[PDB]
Amino acid sequence: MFKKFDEKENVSNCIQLKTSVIKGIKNQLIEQFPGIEPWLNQIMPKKDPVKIVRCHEHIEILTVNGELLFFRQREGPFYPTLRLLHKYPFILPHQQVDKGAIKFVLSGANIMCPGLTSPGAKLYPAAVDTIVAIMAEGKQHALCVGVMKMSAEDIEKVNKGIGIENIHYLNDGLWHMKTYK
């Protein structure tokens, strides 16, 4: 979603949200990510203004104190940024690709089922459309936010095709935008 993204050519503007809208977005974050609820006072303090950075193709980025927390496109689901996920890795269920696939997902490629079924990888049960944190064999931190395009049982069985859609990866255009300011 951010492979050729950058502030100049993609960010139209940045609106500050009213209290009515913030409570609604928090509620949607709760519904999507149940375990985030006890941490929201910490991620989005009462005291701090909440902004949406509006981007081309109806991408919105939620920011607090200039830190990028979540993003969505249209009124689709929210996805954590990788920076937020690194601070709170438990927000998302995990899938672990084999180390050979690291180079390809860091260049923006979608995850193919052999990256998840080969030795060194770890595939965990997941329904299609689940937002997952992509971990890497031998690596402590997540490198990609993905969406299951086949269920994890299908990925084991079909074993060919896109298993996981690459949505956001380390040093993509979103990653490079460290803060909004």
Binding site: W39, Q42, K87, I102, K139, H141, L143, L170, K178
Partner: peptide, 24 residues
């Protein structure tokens, strides 16, 4: 039991230092 984690990001490639390997 205490969060947020503070992950060290490399000062040149901006990645976690375990991913430096992948950035020239």
């Amino acid at each position: 039991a205490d969060y947020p984690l503070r992950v060290l990001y490399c000062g040149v490639c901006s990645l976690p230092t375990e991913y430096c390997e992948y950035m020239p």
